[PDB]
Design a binder for this molecule. Structure first.
Ligand code: FAD
Ligand code: FAD
Ligand code: FAD
Ligand code: FAD
Ligand code: ARG
Ligand code: ARG
Ligand code: ARG
Lengths: 448, 448, 448, 448
């Protein structure tokens, strides 16, 4: 794709260049390829990224981490396996395809799947601005005296300098993913770090890999266990503690009949379900994604735990402990020492031990309400009284017909789980979704 | 153990000779063995069985069925691995121990684990009366003019003849397991059979294994899937239908941290938990037992399902279908034909297809309220106003100190899940429980 | 590809339309596709098949049989994953790609992989003649008075009618695969059937699936075990016997470091090795292919074997027996009965039991010397004294420069294991090989 | 068992207190136990150990190492699962039996299986002399003027002091296991260490775990891979090289039909086989034990190898390399540097790279000819001309009837593979063998 001057009115502007946005670029590429598309000027497009270059959750690129989805659900295959942008094609291009096969694995390393996506991302370098974090989407009318909005202005603070530029577009896509979630009862402290910053910020706080540190992990999801399992290797002399409110780490559900809610086609049937059944579906199918660990990592962790029992039959004296059904009441981070003091209570409804730590990893997951801050200026374009954005099946936010021109729009991606299903936040349907997105955004063009 | 004349007052009488009762016999055996017990007249004991000989759920001994618990949790090992009555010893005695090892399996076939238990059961043939189904436990006072109950009479209808005999005992144990549960909206019909009668009664109704029958299964638990998976093999020309109210068959949870609620020691900690936390524990740990299928059988079933898709892309035309999220509203069993008519509806809250079948297997699980009918005569011995039996930690039912002598008692087994945990109904703690039972029942004796 | 009139001189004629020939068609297709090839009249080509339509070893399409190679080593992916003719693309076209993924298997069913290949084969129906079995390749000179051979005539007996036609070509490819191998000490009998005819001919001999037959299997390779394992299901009342000269069925070796001899690139390094090292390589790497069973099927078979031991501790009285280290000395097939008599001896170097059977399946593998019969007329074109065809790296048979024009040639496929390695007879390198073949055959054309 | 004064004539003296000797102690214990044996003065017995306390290959107790045999083939179960000395009983005694079960593993850690055996070994501390390494077995005649030998003197150098004591016995057992094997073309050097000394001596040579060392491993068996896989963890900055003469690391064969040669009963049938068939059996069943790695560790190692390819596509620049089909011609260990220089050649029959290393681990396996040195004084008691010890089925060495009294003997253990089979050197039949040994040695006593 060719670059568009900043000054010009774009056909489409995307906020975020993670997997979801990247899949749109790919599908737009493919739709325009006469090789893959017998039908096939070029659309004027731009992607804006807070990061200085493409990375995929670098703060959680723990050594040994695997991806949790089949390599077949890559960025292109499910829409079209002929596509240039498939995992297998990427592998072939690196000279690794015969070698990957010999693993007989469906689950590449996280590190490798990032490079596949980085290899995709580099081919849209003409149309992606990096280090540009979007601070607001603002309505605009080509006819200032008229009462009709037909474009949107999107402004971003430069990460390096701080300068704010603007780029005008008819259509907007917010694919920003998630923001780190932090329990409200936790104080602000450099010792207190969220899982998303584990690889990037913990090495600078605990600079000595040799030192007898005390480290704690709050959580029982996938992040929790990866960190907890990594701490034993990365800090061999540390005493690690895993605090969780549940009784146990629970296996993630990938069973073939359950796993079909992740089918691209099921999105239509899911969307069509009532709110009662959607709330019901997500709550029953919870263990496909949330607060669950991969079985193999549970078994790996348990087996380490058992090894300690062979060495010492007294559990309180182990190096690496698990404390189930505990909440945190007080944190003391003003004591003169290098170690802050964590107070614990039974997570059961109606005073346990007190821990001293050099760091606290909080692996409490992610929220997905980040678009609100960007769209508050655009809130007055909804139907009267509507205090929440309503996404349609094509992902366009319902707006007011008399206030917004049909050419103008805003789509959301990765936040629509409550309307589209458990696959929305994930990699599952990105190939097909991207293709569908190219259909709603550019479909006027692509028909002629 | 030596036999006791019918006429005499027993130290202990057990209703039921399934695994739970059998484990008590074993533990009593072991406690009295000077080889295993340096401490060691013989207690006067009797077991009463409805069945004519020991069998372990023969109506569900489906070809290929595996047991779902480690062979280590056999009837004796966890109390004492030296015991004569371990699985490995049984295997050694059959000349199969070197051979079993080569399987490298923890899960014997159901058929084989029955023979192990049948091999145990045959060694108490002196003290077990078969074909004797217990119809009531009745209080008795050695001093008729006194207001104190010190024994219990237990009467049983002979399965062959119908005659009723009685046997007096100081202590009683009700280990009767479960009774088949049947949805109330289902009519009484020979075509309608519960999973517990699948192997024993379905061959007599559908006598021709060749014939193009239509068979249906109601359920999504382990019984459901075994029957459903067996129907394809046992009736090759039949059209099978699996009806379930859930969206999908769900994997059973055997993950190492979760599976620790099944630890013998955890029973104490569980018992000590409040009612709020117990209700909470069982509901969160649900998938360790109820409404769940073994992962391997789900995968086996799915893969068969996929094979059909390779043959025909039209799902309505498959031989073996799954109908998810459907309830049954009407059953028509008065039509002139060999086939009764099943009407279905969405199990979702607010009219689908109508099925015609030659048989309906209902795999709707088991209830465990069967002791009430036997204990209603004994209900007036509880504390004032108590309308439910309260089991203590040792499993003795709380009674009235001023109405019942300390020598006299009643214990329950396999119904106390609500107070003892998910392991109660199962094989998990039987070795240790039996040993504990021998401690409460015979512990006065065994101290001297 | 467009059809060529019979009368005209072809650029290339292939004998056989199995996987190897089919991969050449595919690679030729791809080389000529401007979509996949920016470089891209059409070559005049023809494939001649003995079978009336494409099938892939239909006589061994046993129920439940899996393929033994990754689906990635399909007919196109390793040359180019973008290709229209990949497994994943085929699946996508059938609407099964999301469904196949949920299996999380690398090994499709044999039945399914045949349909994938049948789906490929149908797209060259213009250039493939079916029911045409090739009986000889014959030299021809455009200049009869000259001493130079520049074309070859290829004649085939019509399977339906018997008529013999001829088609002239400059280049020839013999990709006929293998012929059934039969021990010389076995007499000719309809009761004696080779594994390759198991599905197609055994049902007509043993017409009653109910009947208490005695069936025997000679062999210990993959064919042996599939038949043996299938007999128990397909004939439930039969007594099956597996005779083998080895002590045991041995696991096939798919271990990642060993499995790299199957890498496309390794063919060059293998070809370059001396005869001493090649003989050495194939003999050490034997268990990657020959006389070996898949581990899972060994375990499946063993576990069935153990089930019988639980039922009867006497091994001679089992329904399904294995007789290790036995050879067959006499066969008696002239007795009046329906059952011929098999005499056995220790396969050990220096009289055991005698079996009576209704059928004998011989699973003794395949030879690959079938091209000789077709090429005997062409033998005088080799270098003086050369009594064996020498294949080059590009697979062209070395011939005499002064007797054969450079435009004229003969290539071999699937028989060159002794020079190309264990992957030659298999599906391993077909994608890449086909592409390489298109390079040697059509490379003059494709450069311009 | 009670201690015997040094001065007295013993019934039995064992050289070695590893698993084999320890199993004899256990079986003797069990035979004498009236609990396990209704039949049951005590035999006068002594075990002599070079080590200061019981350890099981401590120099190869690599972190993470698993045992390669089922826990069922422990020291007692296969003879009698009731025995006090079973693994499951040991676990129960440690309070780990419920916990071990939750692993659902048949293969305990090496570290744990050592503690089980150490827990056995501690119960014969009365009859085991530690730090006593046996230097010779010497004939003795109670009647010096007679020509009949009826006892043996056994002398041992004290490891601490050097003093030599003697103990007289009628019967002797040499269960010394194996001695480290070293290629003859390797020079004597502290940098050159055999796998058996890896954990115990390499930490003292390479004292800094941080330092960028170059380390090499010669071998492709289990020892090779464990060391190679451990080096990456234990020395994170080292460059490791695995040199092997084979093309690849090969999977160990544990397949159920093959694995039956390890059956206790098969020893009789094996022993009875001719020398031609024995040589044949061991050579065909080679991969059950020798020059083979566990599949999981091969896959683990391969996957690490692949991870490097994702980081760098140039193989020569990887940190951890495998060099297949290479032999070592010259070693240079006189250069001034800390690094000696290794020269390599193709292991193929008819000059490659030269490596520089700080250490060389040689994992070239074990020989088992160590008894000769101890028995040379006893050689004149064999039949005329016999220059090799012949073990009988009961393991007694054939001797001369006219020179040796029937009360006097010598048994061998763990060296008799050539006559008893692949299980001899291993843990497979120790339970049963020990019991059989107690039968031949003490059977006169135990009948009365
Ligand atoms: C550690 C981890 C591993 C995961 N792996 C799996 C897996 O195995 N399989 C799977 O299917 N899913 C997994 N996921 C779920 C994950 O949400 C998706 O895989 C995927 O990241 C979805 O990407 P996205 O399009 O939501 O964008 P995200 O990856 O969430 O990132 C959006 C991008 O927009 C940028 N951005 C944010 N705000 C702004 C702004 N104001 N202006 C400009 N740019 C902005 C961000 O920096 C980022 O580059 C994982 C999640 C985590 C935390
Ligand atoms: C098909 C199936 C398979 C199972 N396998 C597993 C497994 O893999 N692992 C596991 O741990 N658990 C499993 N269970 C759970 C099962 O409840 C226990 O394994 C076990 O059967 C518990 O036995 P129990 O002592 O409750 O007696 P039960 O086996 O329930 O039987 C009690 C006995 O008392 C007899 N009886 C009943 N009423 C009377 C009366 N009035 N008078 C006299 N006698 C009477 C019955 O005929 C029976 O013999 C399974 C359950 C089913 C249905
Ligand atoms: C049961 C079975 C399963 C197998 N599956 C595996 C597997 O899992 N993975 C794997 O990699 N390999 C496997 N193979 C190995 C097999 O050789 C290859 O997979 C594959 O069939 C190679 O095909 P080919 O090109 O040699 O042709 P083949 O499949 O051997 O057939 C050649 C074709 O030429 C035709 N033909 C023969 N003679 C003539 C003539 N005179 N004139 C005209 N036409 C003729 C034949 O009818 C046939 O159509 C399997 C083999 C068998 C027996
Ligand atoms: C690292 C490793 C792991 C193994 N694990 C497995 C496994 O997973 N499964 C399995 O079945 N087999 C395995 N083995 C094979 C091993 O040979 C047996 O498991 C077992 O050690 C056999 O023991 P043994 O009786 O031969 O005595 P060994 O263990 O070989 O030791 C004999 C004892 O005698 C002592 N001794 C030696 N010479 C003298 C002397 N002159 N005087 C006095 N004492 C002496 C030694 O110090 C030693 O204590 C393993 C081998 C190795 C090297
Ligand atoms: N635990 C997760 N993050 N799961 C997300 C992927 C869901 C499922 N593996 C799929 O096939 O799409
Ligand atoms: N699905 C079941 N029936 N589970 C019962 C057994 C629970 C668990 N396997 C245990 O170790 O005790
Ligand atoms: N047993 C066999 N037929 N093996 C042939 C395939 C070899 C190996 N699986 C590969 O990757 O190519």
């Amino acid at each position: 794709l060719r670059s568009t001057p900043q000054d010009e009115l774009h056909d489409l502007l995307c906020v975020g260049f993670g997997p979801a946005s990247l899949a749109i670029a790919i599908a737009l590429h493919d739709a325009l390829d006469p090789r893959l598309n017998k039908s096939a000027a070029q659309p004027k497009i731009c992607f804006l990224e807070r990061q200085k270059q493409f990375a995929w959750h670098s703060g959680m690129l723990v050594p040994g981490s695997k991806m949790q989805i089949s390599f077949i659900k890559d960025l292109a295959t499910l829409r079209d396996p002929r596509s240039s942008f498939t995992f297998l094609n990427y592998l072939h291009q690196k000279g690794r395809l015969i070698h990957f096969t010999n693993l007989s694995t469906f689950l590449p390393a996280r590190l490798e799947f990032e490079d596949y996506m980085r290899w995709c991302a580099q081919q849209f370098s003409d149309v992606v601005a990096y280090g540009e974090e979007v601070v607001e989407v603002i309505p605009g009318k080509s006819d200032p005296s008229s009462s009709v909005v037909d474009f949107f202005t999107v402004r971003s603070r430069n990460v390096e300098t701080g300068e704010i530029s603007a780029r005008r577009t008819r259509k907007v896509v917010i694919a920003i993913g998630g923001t780190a979630k932090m329990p409200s009862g936790l104080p602000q402290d450099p010792r207190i770090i969220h899982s998303s910053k584990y690889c990037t910020t913990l090495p600078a706080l605990l600079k000595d890999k040799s030192k007898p540190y005390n480290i704690a992990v709050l959580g029982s999801g996938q992040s929790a266990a990866e960190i907890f399992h990594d701490l034993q290797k990365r800090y061999p002399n540390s005493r690690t503690t895993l605090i969780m409110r549940d009784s146990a780490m629970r296996p993630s559900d990938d069973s073939p009949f359950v796993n079909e809610i992740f089918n691209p086609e099921r999105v239509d049937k899911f969307y069509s379900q009532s709110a009662a059944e959607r709330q019901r579906s997500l709550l029953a199918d919870k263990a496909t994604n949330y607060s669950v660990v991969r079985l193999e990592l549970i078994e790996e962790i348990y087996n380490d735990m058992y090894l300690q029992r062979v060495k010492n039959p007294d559990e309180t004296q182990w190096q690496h402990r698990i404390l189930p059904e505990r909440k945190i009441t007080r944190v003391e981070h003003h004591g003169p020492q290098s170690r802050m003091r964590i107070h614990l209570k039974s997570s059961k409804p109606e005073v346990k031990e007190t821990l001293e730590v050099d760091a606290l990893m909080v692996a409490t997951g992610y929220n997905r309400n980040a678009h609100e801050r960007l769209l508050s200026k655009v809130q007055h374009l909804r139907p009267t009284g509507q205090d929440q954005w309503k996404p349609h099946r094509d992902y366009r936010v319902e707006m007011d017909p008399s206030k917004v021109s049909s050419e103008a729009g805003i789509w959301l991606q990765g936040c629509n789980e409550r309307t589209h299903g458990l696959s929305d936040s994930l990699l599952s349907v990105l190939a097909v979704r991207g293709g569908e997105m190219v259909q709603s955004i550019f479909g006027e063009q692509l028909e002629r």
